[PDB]
From TrEMBL, chain A:
<keyword id="KW-0479">Metal-binding</keyword>
<dbReference type="InterPro" id="IPR051555">
    <property type="entry name" value="FDH_Electron_Transfer_Unit"/>
</dbReference>
<feature type="binding site">
    <location>
        <position position="11"/>
    </location>
    <ligand>
        <name>[4Fe-4S] cluster 1</name>
    </ligand>
</feature>
<feature type="binding site">
    <location>
        <position position="76"/>
    </location>
    <ligand>
        <name>[4Fe-4S] cluster 3</name>
    </ligand>
</feature>
<dbReference type="GO" id="GO:0030313">
    <property type="term" value="C:cell envelope"/>
</dbReference>
<dbReference type="GO" id="GO:0051539">
    <property type="term" value="F:4 iron, 4 sulfur cluster binding"/>
</dbReference>
<feature type="binding site">
    <location>
        <position position="156"/>
    </location>
    <ligand>
        <name>[4Fe-4S] cluster 1</name>
    </ligand>
</feature>
<feature type="domain" description="4Fe-4S ferredoxin-type">
    <location>
        <begin position="2"/>
        <end position="32"/>
    </location>
</feature>
<dbReference type="GO" id="GO:0046872">
    <property type="term" value="F:metal ion binding"/>
</dbReference>
UniProtKB/TrEMBL annotation, chain B:
<dbReference type="GO" id="GO:0051539">
    <property type="term" value="F:4 iron, 4 sulfur cluster binding"/>
</dbReference>
<keyword id="KW-0732">Signal</keyword>
<dbReference type="GO" id="GO:0030151">
    <property type="term" value="F:molybdenum ion binding"/>
</dbReference>
<dbReference type="GO" id="GO:0008863">
    <property type="term" value="F:formate dehydrogenase (NAD+) activity"/>
</dbReference>
<feature type="domain" description="4Fe-4S Mo/W bis-MGD-type">
    <location>
        <begin position="8"/>
        <end position="67"/>
    </location>
</feature>
<keyword id="KW-0711">Selenium</keyword>
<keyword id="KW-0560">Oxidoreductase</keyword>
<dbReference type="Pfam" id="PF00384">
    <property type="entry name" value="Molybdopterin"/>
</dbReference>
<keyword id="KW-0106">Calcium</keyword>
Amino acid sequence: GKMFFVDLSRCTACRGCQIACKQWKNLPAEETRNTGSHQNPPDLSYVTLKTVRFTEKSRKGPGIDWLFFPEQCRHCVEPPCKGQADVDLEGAVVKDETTGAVLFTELTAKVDGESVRSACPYDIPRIDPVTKRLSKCDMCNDRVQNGLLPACVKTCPTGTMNFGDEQEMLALAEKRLAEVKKTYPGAVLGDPNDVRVVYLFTRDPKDFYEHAVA
Amino acid sequence: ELQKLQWAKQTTSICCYCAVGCGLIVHTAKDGQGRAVNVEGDPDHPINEGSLCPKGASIFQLGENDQRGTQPLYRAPFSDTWKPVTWDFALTEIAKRIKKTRDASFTEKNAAGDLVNRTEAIASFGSAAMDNEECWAYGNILRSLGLVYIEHQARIXHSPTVPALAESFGRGAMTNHWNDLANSDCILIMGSNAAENHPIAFKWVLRAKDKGATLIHVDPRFTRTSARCDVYAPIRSGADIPFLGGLIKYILDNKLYFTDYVREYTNASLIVGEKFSFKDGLFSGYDAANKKYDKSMWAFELDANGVPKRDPALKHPRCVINLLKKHYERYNLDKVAAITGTSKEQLQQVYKAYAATGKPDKAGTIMYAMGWTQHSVGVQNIRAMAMIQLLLGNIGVAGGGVNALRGESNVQGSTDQGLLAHIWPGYNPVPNSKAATLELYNAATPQSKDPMSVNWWQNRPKYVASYLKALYPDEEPAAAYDYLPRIDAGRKLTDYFWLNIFEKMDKGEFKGLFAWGMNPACGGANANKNRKAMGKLEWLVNVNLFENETSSFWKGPGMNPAEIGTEVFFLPCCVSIEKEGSVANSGRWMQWRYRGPKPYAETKPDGDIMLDMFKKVRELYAKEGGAYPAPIAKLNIADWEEHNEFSPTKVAKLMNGYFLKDTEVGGKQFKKGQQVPSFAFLTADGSTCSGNWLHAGSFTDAGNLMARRDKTQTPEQARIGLFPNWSFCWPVNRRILYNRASVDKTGKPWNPAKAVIEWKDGKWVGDVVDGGGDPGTKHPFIMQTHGFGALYGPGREEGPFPEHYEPLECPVSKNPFSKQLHNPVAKAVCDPRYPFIGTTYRVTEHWQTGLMTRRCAWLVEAEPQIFCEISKELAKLRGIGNGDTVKVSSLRGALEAVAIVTERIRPFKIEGVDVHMVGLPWHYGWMVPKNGGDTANLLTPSAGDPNTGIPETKAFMVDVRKVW
Ligand SMILES: Nc1nc2c(c(=O)[nH]1)N[C@H]1C(S)=C(S)[C@@H](COP(=O)(O)OP(=O)(O)OC[C@H]3O[C@@H](n4cnc5c(=O)[nH]c(N)nc54)[C@H](O)[C@@H]3O)O[C@H]1N2
Ligand SMILES: Nc1nc2c(c(=O)[nH]1)N[C@H]1C(S)=C(S)[C@@H](COP(=O)(O)OP(=O)(O)OC[C@H]3O[C@@H](n4cnc5c(=O)[nH]c(N)nc54)[C@H](O)[C@@H]3O)O[C@H]1N2
Ligand code: SF4
Ligand code: SF4
Ligand code: SF4
Ligand code: SF4
Ligand SMILES: [S]
Ligand SMILES: [W+6]
């Protein structure tokens, strides 16, 4: 299968990834307002599969620790969302056998959407209020099967986003973690044996987002 | 197959936003016959490798946008509404307004009786957004009509760089390029927010860090750049010269300079005359009455042959290097820490890390952009950076340079094409009223008697003659010289610039304004003044992608259309991906891009709008006569057109230049009609034309070198990322300027692992050598009169060495370095009702005034409204909570914004008092979106200074109050 390695020690919060996800899928923009933050949209929604979360942490002396978290579906190896949806109807949540993408279909309208969101350890699924369909990151699975990178990985200027075969990405994650620890000694990988989106955090993952790790 | 892209034609383009110059791939429906269906990164492009920031990544939404202009709109005097009109009506009536105003206002001779052949009743603003061929054609159209008031964006953010770096190195350009950042051992980012404002540059900055570089950000604020640097050092607004002066002192005291480089390649050894002195904050030759220096008091001592004397031992007390040591001895760590507010610990850390690059096999680079270099000593701020780089041997080397980052996609090119009041294309000056002949114009170029000094500007007569032959091929250059307008020799040059154009408009002194690809109703400082002043125009032509605050100023906030007599023409232009042409990025890479979709609706490329408009004026002169028709009737526009349309290819070929007759030059025979292979083969005798000598080499008999997409590199080229077969850079594909300074007197690189050039088997290999000649036979700075990198720079108005003069007038009363508080060659009220330092800056997601990005729903989604960033300390003082609505006010205006309360802003300690900064984005305007807010330029002053002609947008006084 495939895997993302997301090195958060390289992220400039440019939000190229956030825009590129919507350009590739021609997703609509939400109505947003500034409530005292650069972060927007404030949350994932039926029409927002990725948003960059911004967190400021105080430190001794000048500046802050500014934590950026481009949130997406983790494409779990054994996805609880599928185990929940399968109670109501098989085919609502499926897994691509070659890539490992976890994919929501139109049949998500025929299952308990709220129950599927609740089953997700990362709080990822989002419900359309009108049609009751569920959406989330689909790994750009059509691009991947056609030999292209996902839209957010291709757009990333910094090398934060990385994508490829699971063996090469786990090896990259191990090598990079050892290098990043020279600058950020508390660096850790997020749930690296359980998911296909492996984040490198520079400190306690929960400082980046309440649901950063399981 | 991907269904979305099946049946679509793929073409390449270059991003229409910042000067990084990222590559795009555009997919166009019906095999090129429909609309764009996708826009994303070009995976093969060597700068971005497919990456795009949110601005490039949303170009699909900019282009395929149902809010775009569709056809010309006409607003009659005193009308409440637009009326849709034909191109024929709009361009016919505009040509009549141009001719009526020109005929009534044209001046053959000025008050003194000198030939000037000009009209002062029309002004033009714009634009770095146009393609290079369009910018070149536009300036020549305006000058053929007799205009002198020709300005654009470059006045603000580019103009201080050109004389600072030209004084130091001989050219004004960014010295290196984006890919080259990955070769640096220490990157100092100071007066730049590059992670937000040049985002793909961080690909290369972070690759430097991967190879062991230290990344340093020096900024009054903690930004998205600061988050990814090793060192963040806060600095008080306007304390840059003290910071940089302290680094000069640190380098000299600790002997960290590159001794052999300094001795051989800088003017360290030159003997300054006995008339040079500095005392009490003033150089010698100060005229207190006129607030100006007699710069002759700063001259070098000349030998019997007229060449500046040199002491290669560097022992003479009047050696440049010894005067430099004496000048900077005052910039001790205690005084620099006190004024910068940077801790002595952090200053030592930054100075140690950066000065370590004085080692021959280490390179440091400085990245700066607009920062706060607009004030009256911004030129001296940049001079100090250039001096540090020369002391450390960082000019001409891989991972070195002064990377003066350009702002917009083509601000390099628009400046290169002379869209500023003081320059023709190729940096040949606009003649003044005393330059009565072409021979007198040419007489002004300084000569050198040093046989090792190339002094390349001695070739200027070839470039001016070849330019006049491009415009007027059937005339002798000496005769065509009389067709182009002249500025008054007796007037301050700043009278012709940006700020004074707004001031003259407010005095009712302009009949007509072209706002060509700009939004001055939002981008001009003191927007309340400027919006009122536009009502004093008889006519306004706005060429733009969308209706905007400039096109529609007459129905803006507080405006009664029934009282505003201005006639307005709105002409909708096409987006970048709807046309062909070139843009020159910050590294001087001149990149060709192609049409994907046809122009939307009835929109037109700029080249067609301006050429159609000019042809109609010419037709009116042919039928009616009028003021001095020759410059209009005789202009060569046949070379600009193919198949009844503006031809980017033909204009690019003319800008390169071609032989007008069989010609022997440089011991080679050329045939009539051949393209000029390089500016080395231009002539002063009328045998050659060239629209821009810097373009000679870009489009030769070999073809369009700007359109090369060839990643072929030798090992030495690939080691440093020159990509010499990808596009073309001026001059003659020299990717790293000043590269003769990167080798010793035998042609061996100082840093063989990162060689730029090397002498091997009787030739220079790697980059194109910046100046021909065997190793050890020429001085390395070929555009300098004397050949040397200038530590001592006696052409600068404020003095030959940078010196701290306080740019923050209101909160500062003391200068620790001298008795001279403010710039002695340079009106702030400092009303106590406005106690805070307002500043304006950018965010990653919006572009300039936001005219473009406020129309893109994905960018509004991320940054929907004007905000005000304040410290926890100021929030506590004023009772402001995060996300509260605040009123920000100044002597000039007031606006509402959402408060962002953050530890990323801290108070400045100035003379024992906390002084608070208030940050605003200038990306908002009343037209769009709903509840977005208006321009931060409602708050900014419009004073400027008599030397720069630039307004204060980085430190202006405000109040902030909670709104309930
Ligand atoms: N996203 C985005 N990118 C852009 C643009 C845009 O609108 N949006 N505009 C483009 C254009 S036209 C330009 S000219 C460039 C400009 O690019 P920049 O110069 O990077 O732009 P700013 O954000 O205005 O200013 C940079 C930094 O200068 C700091 N600064 C302010 N005062 C001082 C001072 O006294 N000393 C020092 N050392 N720093 C100071 C500010 O805090 C700020 O972080 O950006 C270009 N790129
Ligand atoms: N307070 C404050 N004021 C500032 C600054 C600041 O930092 N603070 N920055 C200053 C600087 S550095 C700059 S660069 C200026 C920018 O000021 P402006 O140039 O007036 O700003 P915009 O109009 O937003 O710039 C984008 C423009 O490009 C046009 N455009 C895009 N493509 C094309 C095309 O093909 N043809 C034509 N004809 N137009 C096209 C759009 O219609 C739009 O008008 O603002 C300056 N003003
Ligand atoms: S992988 Fe595709 S769907 Fe998922 S966040 Fe990235 S661009 Fe969006
Ligand atoms: S992150 Fe949640 S939604 Fe995504 S695969 Fe895992 S359980 Fe399913
Ligand atoms: S594109 Fe890359 S650097 Fe930019 S916000 Fe997304 S992950 Fe971070
Ligand atoms: S705005 Fe600049 S960094 Fe962003 S995609 Fe365009 S050229 Fe590249
Ligand atoms: S610019
Ligand atoms: W600019």
